[PDB]
Amino acid sequence: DPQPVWDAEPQFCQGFLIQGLWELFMDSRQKNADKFLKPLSWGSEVLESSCNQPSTALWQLERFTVPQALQKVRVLKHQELLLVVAVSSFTRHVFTCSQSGIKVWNLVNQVAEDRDPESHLKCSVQDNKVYLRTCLLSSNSRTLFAGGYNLPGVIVWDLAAPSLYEKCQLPCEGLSCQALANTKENMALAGFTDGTVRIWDLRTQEIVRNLKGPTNSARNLVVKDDNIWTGGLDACLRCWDLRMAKVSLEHLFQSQIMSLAHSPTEDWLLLGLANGQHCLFNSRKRDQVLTVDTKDNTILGLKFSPNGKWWASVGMGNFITVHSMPTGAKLFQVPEVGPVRCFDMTENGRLIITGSRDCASVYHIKY
Amino acid sequence: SLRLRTRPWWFPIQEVSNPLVLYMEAWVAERVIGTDQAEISEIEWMCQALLTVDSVNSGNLAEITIFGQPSAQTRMKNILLNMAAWHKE
Amino acid sequence: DLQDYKAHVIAKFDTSVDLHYDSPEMKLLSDAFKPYQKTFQPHTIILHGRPGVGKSALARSIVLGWAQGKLFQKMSFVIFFSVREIKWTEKSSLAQLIAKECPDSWDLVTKIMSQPERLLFVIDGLDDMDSVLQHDDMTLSRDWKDEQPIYILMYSLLRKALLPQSFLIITTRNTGLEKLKSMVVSPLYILVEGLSASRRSQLVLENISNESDRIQVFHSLIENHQLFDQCQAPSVCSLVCEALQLQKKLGKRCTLPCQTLTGLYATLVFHQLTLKRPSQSALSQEEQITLVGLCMMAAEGVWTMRSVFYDDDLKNYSLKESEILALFHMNILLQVGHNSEQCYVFSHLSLQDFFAALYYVLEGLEEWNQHFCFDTRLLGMKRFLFGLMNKDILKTLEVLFEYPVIPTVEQKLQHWVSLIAQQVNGTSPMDTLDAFYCLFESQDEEFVGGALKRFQEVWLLINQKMDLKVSSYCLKHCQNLKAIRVDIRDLLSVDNTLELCPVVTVQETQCKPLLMEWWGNFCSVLGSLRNLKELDLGDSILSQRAMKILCLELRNQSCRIQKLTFKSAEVVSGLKHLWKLLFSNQNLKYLNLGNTPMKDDDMKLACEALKHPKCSVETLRLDSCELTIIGYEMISTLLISTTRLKCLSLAKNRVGVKSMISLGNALSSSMCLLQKLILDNCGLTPASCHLLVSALFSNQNLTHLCLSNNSLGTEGVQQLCQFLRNPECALQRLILNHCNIVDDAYGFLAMRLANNTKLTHLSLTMNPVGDGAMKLLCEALKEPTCYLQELELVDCQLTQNCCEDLACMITTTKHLKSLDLGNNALGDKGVITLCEGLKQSSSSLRRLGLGACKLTSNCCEALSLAISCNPHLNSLNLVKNDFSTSGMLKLCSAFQCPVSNLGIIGLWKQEYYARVRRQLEEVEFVKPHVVIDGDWYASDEDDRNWWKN
């Protein structure tokens, strides 16, 4: 009903001068204040001034900041329905995944709207018809994982080599990937459609263990120091201990778990249900799950801040909302065109990429 | 009048157009850089900068060229200078 | 029949005898097509580099080496394609192209049978076909012997869809890689570089004039990265040296500059043009059309991304090789091609950029179209176009073209440079440095001076020496500048660095680095500016010598800087020099020395300098400096002594008991004259606070006081109220932004606020005051004998239970004019009962802050009605609230009303749909004095942030 109108957002100064020179040339051959946004300098920072505050923070409260607004700076033009987005600000790259391939973009380029990727990795020609579903990027930005529907395994790419080439296969013949995770012990794990979570040794490509649950119960998968948190359509959250290799905890929820996240610093676990309700669960004490919000639309994305003082949410409600962590109070909203299906945030907490229909918009976080 | 160098795919082409150049004594340049290449490439991956060493000068001077954004150039230069200072002592 | 083909290709490719060698670089090429990792073996190599380096020669040498041996033996067949020399719109096939390359045809049928395994393609150029792609869709070729335009088969072979499992080596340009990298499948990139930096330096050095200006011009050329980078090509270095020699020969008859590429290119082209003339005159008309057509064709090629210029293009502009060669007598627009069709390319891309820029100046001279029958790639043309605006080049053009030359684009360039200056939320340093670099190219005082007249504030990052030089050049003409900030992170960090670039020293006697003297010139320029009065060193880290030079140049008598900031800079080493500046410049009255530790001696010298009769500093910020007992004792003996200081800040450093008694003894004295005192985030205990207020009880000089982020007892609040009770207190503003004030203490404050003047401001932020204390505070404010003006209650525990009381106070007060309610849950009913009394405008309230108050879209009608008829309200905050589209539309209609006089509206407008955005734009259009910004706390009409700086 309410149709947001997209406008050419950046109009940087250099583009203004170039467009001015372009018009004069065509003007000659016929007879026969303005607002500019700050550029993303070097693909890293914006070089702006922080907002004012009513008071001064405590001496020990230095690195714990919350955002105030988001500003759009670029649109990356994928040409298919976007599914997943990843960043890894260490190398200033962006990975966008669709059902037919993964496009790699560089943030160093200063373009209002980017249509030329750094690389276009695909796998469709290998078999008769193969779809991709998900992609993952490791913490140190040296490995990329991709998983799909009809693949013979999850594809592993090396990103620290002089060339971009396929590395591993990690065999899984007749399953749909549906989830990916990585651990510090140099192991990989994935959770398929029929409830199996399989763990491979990354260096030898050898299957270490298989964990079995009910159908569609492994849609979301989070790894911690020695625990594995899983949840899906069956509306239950379970925790597996890798040592004793059975379920440890089982908690029942009133609606299907659509997204899961974990706080980097504290011991909180974030649940996003299909009725718009957020939930906080203590992963250590495990007493009771406390509901913080309510919405009319479903929730498809959830991610914590690098310092774990706030979080962001996306869904089918045309909006990207930011909430403060302590009590869950909403901070602000930013509208979009359609169902936002994926987003990601940089490690230094400066950027946020968001993929709505087939364009990935990158926003700068204003503190 | 021709030098060849591999460029890793992850290095943007926009940062190959403004290098940083330093000169130092030749006897330190080869002993600090060394012969092996895996360690050098690992250092480039960490610093997100590329470095090249040229010793064609008839004198005792060696020229080191560093590619990257200014922070990367500064960090790599500090690493090289610290290693050279330790090695000379 | 392969040996005959090998011998033929040996005969065809033979142009270099002493340029063929088993060099290490060829070996990297040869060993490149080997598995670097045991799993991975690349099948595509992309060679890229600057336009003028030897890449085509490298590809030809590859083919030659295969044709003789010692280079490639596994590859049984090698095919060389050069795409700049063929026409690429006709329908052809791969077999026809190979047969054109391979004189015999019977070999190919047997070669194709099993050779695709061992077969190599060497493609040269591939940069001119970046324009032919329609970007819509291409039909991929899977087999040869297909009648289809050749660019399609090039695309197919590029994607490994025409002849897969075959090796490719591609020679391309740096700027022709944007559309190419997505096409190829896992390539290996090789970067080709020209002659080295030292050889380039010697080649430039031998050709300079040596007329008493060797060093300055030589360093201006050598440190310019733009010029020095493309001087990698031997052709461009040859052109530069030839231009320098020409300038040396005709020393007096030349007025064009030699510090920029534009000046040198202008020298060359204009000298060659005038060589033709038997006597000095103006160009003939046909010559004018020739030159203008050449410039226009170069400009069209630049815009359309073309560098080949087929013969039909020449016929389009009524051009011909004969007249071009006759007019110039120079190697310009060289012809290549061996078949019936012919191709014409510029001798370099730099010349094409220069002529494209030159087209913009001559386009308005006459009506040229009667005689014609028709962002990285634009950096060079932009730089040349800026450079062409010097008045000497324009004088030469006026001489040649017999008519005055006033280019239209000069207003456009000046307007673009001016648009950078007037930006609402500060200026972007990248754009400022880019504009400075462009303006340095046009060595014209008038143009640069007219461009820089609206800046008034500048932020610069310096990480190269040429940045220092261009900023020093451009800042002389910013005569309206009032505040600057410089960020020099690493250039001046190290104190000593002594090295020589060549084998021998450039000059016999130097005795000083170039960096230090360029820094000194920059500092002298900063010290000579007249309207500038604030300098910030930003994040810069500076060595002793850098600080010594800066302070020496700031000591001069023409420096009128009033504010000095070091709150984010490492200047601990040169602090001694700083002190000598303090009692030598009498215009300085604000020193921000935050975050720099002070030892014993530094504190002693700073205190001794501050006591000087010649010092005039009145504000001293000293937060996050770790003082000792002796430091506090000497601070106190400074405070008692005769000083011009009026504002002191001692934030974020602990205060002991003994230091507290010393400070109190100093403060209690009647000869201490201090106005403002900031003591936030210190370690005051209830005992320390009690002793401090006991000491202050006898003071009648202090007027501002901040004690935020401290621990105060109820006895502390009682002692403060007693200090407030007595007459001659002279205290006007009080800040308690985090002290724990609870219960009966508030009563004391109300008892003090009920009947008291001279106290106009009071901030109670982040204190657990609820509705119970709100009753008392509203009763205290309701009395007519209360002269409070601003009240801040940002993070108190306030609800709707107090809201109606507020309404009454809002109606009944006569002195309060600003009220902030920051993080209080009033909800919607609390707000409606508040605007019940806010609408009637019984008072002169002028600032209301309603952010983060949990307002939905049910309260929008009452707010709209209240702000619709309330002419007194001037500022409003409404961030961090959830407004639907309809309630927000009601608010927007309320804003537009001709009765309201709102000046500041606190909103983030990027959180609403399109219709709300249109309404907000119309709101800004109807009332031009309305500012709709989300940073509501950056508006400071009166001195409200006096304690936070």
PDB file of C-alpha atoms in Angstrom, chain A residues 126-213:
ATOM      1  CA  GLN A 126      28.714 -28.790 -13.128  1.00  0.00           C
ATOM      2  CA  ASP A 127      25.426 -30.702 -12.787  1.00  0.00           C
ATOM      3  CA  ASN A 128      22.098 -30.643 -14.619  1.00  0.00           C
ATOM      4  CA  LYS A 129      20.375 -28.231 -12.222  1.00  0.00           C
ATOM      5  CA  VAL A 130      21.800 -27.127  -8.867  1.00  0.00           C
ATOM      6  CA  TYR A 131      20.569 -24.317  -6.624  1.00  0.00           C
ATOM      7  CA  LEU A 132      22.467 -22.473  -3.915  1.00  0.00           C
ATOM      8  CA  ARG A 133      20.814 -21.765  -0.574  1.00  0.00           C
ATOM      9  CA  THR A 134      23.354 -20.316   1.865  1.00  0.00           C
ATOM     10  CA  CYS A 135      26.904 -19.041   2.225  1.00  0.00           C
ATOM     11  CA  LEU A 136      29.209 -18.500   5.197  1.00  0.00           C
ATOM     12  CA  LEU A 137      32.434 -16.583   5.780  1.00  0.00           C
ATOM     13  CA  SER A 138      34.950 -17.535   8.441  1.00  0.00           C
ATOM     14  CA  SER A 139      36.145 -15.205  11.186  1.00  0.00           C
ATOM     15  CA  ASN A 140      39.667 -14.636   9.821  1.00  0.00           C
ATOM     16  CA  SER A 141      38.366 -14.006   6.270  1.00  0.00           C
ATOM     17  CA  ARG A 142      40.386 -16.812   4.675  1.00  0.00           C
ATOM     18  CA  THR A 143      37.657 -19.280   3.678  1.00  0.00           C
ATOM     19  CA  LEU A 144      34.186 -19.170   2.144  1.00  0.00           C
ATOM     20  CA  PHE A 145      31.550 -21.906   2.347  1.00  0.00           C
ATOM     21  CA  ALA A 146      28.503 -22.369   0.154  1.00  0.00           C
ATOM     22  CA  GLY A 147      25.684 -24.881   0.296  1.00  0.00           C
ATOM     23  CA  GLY A 148      22.645 -25.591  -1.813  1.00  0.00           C
ATOM     24  CA  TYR A 149      19.973 -28.056  -2.850  1.00  0.00           C
ATOM     25  CA  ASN A 150      21.273 -30.470  -5.503  1.00  0.00           C
ATOM     26  CA  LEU A 151      25.009 -30.144  -4.811  1.00  0.00           C
ATOM     27  CA  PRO A 152      27.181 -33.195  -4.059  1.00  0.00           C
ATOM     28  CA  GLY A 153      28.663 -31.276  -1.123  1.00  0.00           C
ATOM     29  CA  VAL A 154      29.299 -27.845   0.335  1.00  0.00           C
ATOM     30  CA  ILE A 155      31.831 -25.911  -1.713  1.00  0.00           C
ATOM     31  CA  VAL A 156      34.876 -24.382  -0.014  1.00  0.00           C
ATOM     32  CA  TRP A 157      36.758 -21.440  -1.535  1.00  0.00           C
ATOM     33  CA  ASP A 158      40.160 -20.105  -0.473  1.00  0.00           C
ATOM     34  CA  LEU A 159      40.304 -16.316  -0.192  1.00  0.00           C
ATOM     35  CA  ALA A 160      43.931 -15.848   0.925  1.00  0.00           C
ATOM     36  CA  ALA A 161      45.515 -17.320  -2.221  1.00  0.00           C
ATOM     37  CA  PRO A 162      46.813 -15.393  -5.250  1.00  0.00           C
ATOM     38  CA  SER A 163      43.817 -16.785  -7.176  1.00  0.00           C
ATOM     39  CA  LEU A 164      40.182 -17.486  -6.317  1.00  0.00           C
ATOM     40  CA  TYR A 165      39.791 -21.232  -6.766  1.00  0.00           C
ATOM     41  CA  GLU A 166      37.803 -24.125  -5.337  1.00  0.00           C
ATOM     42  CA  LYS A 167      39.482 -25.906  -2.446  1.00  0.00           C
ATOM     43  CA  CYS A 168      37.400 -28.670  -0.842  1.00  0.00           C
ATOM     44  CA  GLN A 169      34.128 -30.520  -1.329  1.00  0.00           C
ATOM     45  CA  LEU A 170      32.958 -31.836   2.083  1.00  0.00           C
ATOM     46  CA  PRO A 171      30.714 -34.606   0.715  1.00  0.00           C
ATOM     47  CA  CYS A 172      26.978 -34.666   1.480  1.00  0.00           C
ATOM     48  CA  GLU A 173      25.150 -36.344  -1.381  1.00  0.00           C
ATOM     49  CA  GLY A 174      21.365 -36.175  -1.009  1.00  0.00           C
ATOM     50  CA  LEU A 175      20.721 -33.358   1.460  1.00  0.00           C
ATOM     51  CA  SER A 176      19.891 -29.646   1.307  1.00  0.00           C
ATOM     52  CA  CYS A 177      22.393 -27.479   3.173  1.00  0.00           C
ATOM     53  CA  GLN A 178      20.016 -25.089   5.009  1.00  0.00           C
ATOM     54  CA  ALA A 179      22.640 -23.834   7.501  1.00  0.00           C
ATOM     55  CA  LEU A 180      26.375 -23.416   7.965  1.00  0.00           C
ATOM     56  CA  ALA A 181      28.671 -22.846  10.926  1.00  0.00           C
ATOM     57  CA  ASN A 182      32.377 -22.719  11.723  1.00  0.00           C
ATOM     58  CA  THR A 183      34.413 -23.283  14.875  1.00  0.00           C
ATOM     59  CA  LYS A 184      37.804 -22.222  16.177  1.00  0.00           C
ATOM     60  CA  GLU A 185      39.067 -25.817  16.437  1.00  0.00           C
ATOM     61  CA  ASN A 186      39.382 -25.935  12.606  1.00  0.00           C
ATOM     62  CA  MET A 187      36.148 -27.894  12.145  1.00  0.00           C
ATOM     63  CA  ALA A 188      33.100 -27.217   9.994  1.00  0.00           C
ATOM     64  CA  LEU A 189      29.478 -28.217  10.494  1.00  0.00           C
ATOM     65  CA  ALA A 190      26.199 -27.948   8.617  1.00  0.00           C
ATOM     66  CA  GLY A 191      22.546 -28.666   9.317  1.00  0.00           C
ATOM     67  CA  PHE A 192      20.360 -30.108   6.565  1.00  0.00           C
ATOM     68  CA  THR A 193      16.599 -30.352   5.931  1.00  0.00           C
ATOM     69  CA  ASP A 194      15.989 -33.788   7.482  1.00  0.00           C
ATOM     70  CA  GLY A 195      17.385 -32.724  10.853  1.00  0.00           C
ATOM     71  CA  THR A 196      20.983 -33.917  10.541  1.00  0.00           C
ATOM     72  CA  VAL A 197      23.882 -31.777  11.753  1.00  0.00           C
ATOM     73  CA  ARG A 198      27.116 -33.151  10.312  1.00  0.00           C
ATOM     74  CA  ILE A 199      30.613 -32.155  11.437  1.00  0.00           C
ATOM     75  CA  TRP A 200      33.635 -32.397   9.124  1.00  0.00           C
ATOM     76  CA  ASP A 201      37.319 -31.993   9.882  1.00  0.00           C
ATOM     77  CA  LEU A 202      38.274 -29.082   7.647  1.00  0.00           C
ATOM     78  CA  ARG A 203      41.912 -30.106   7.068  1.00  0.00           C
ATOM     79  CA  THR A 204      41.220 -33.754   6.150  1.00  0.00           C
ATOM     80  CA  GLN A 205      37.604 -33.456   4.891  1.00  0.00           C
ATOM     81  CA  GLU A 206      36.707 -36.364   7.172  1.00  0.00           C
ATOM     82  CA  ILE A 207      33.298 -36.709   8.797  1.00  0.00           C
ATOM     83  CA  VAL A 208      33.734 -36.507  12.571  1.00  0.00           C
ATOM     84  CA  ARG A 209      30.161 -36.954  13.807  1.00  0.00           C
ATOM     85  CA  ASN A 210      26.510 -36.868  12.781  1.00  0.00           C
ATOM     86  CA  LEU A 211      23.656 -35.657  14.989  1.00  0.00           C
ATOM     87  CA  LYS A 212      20.054 -36.608  14.229  1.00  0.00           C
ATOM     88  CA  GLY A 213      16.889 -34.727  15.100  1.00  0.00           C
TER      89      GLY A 213
END
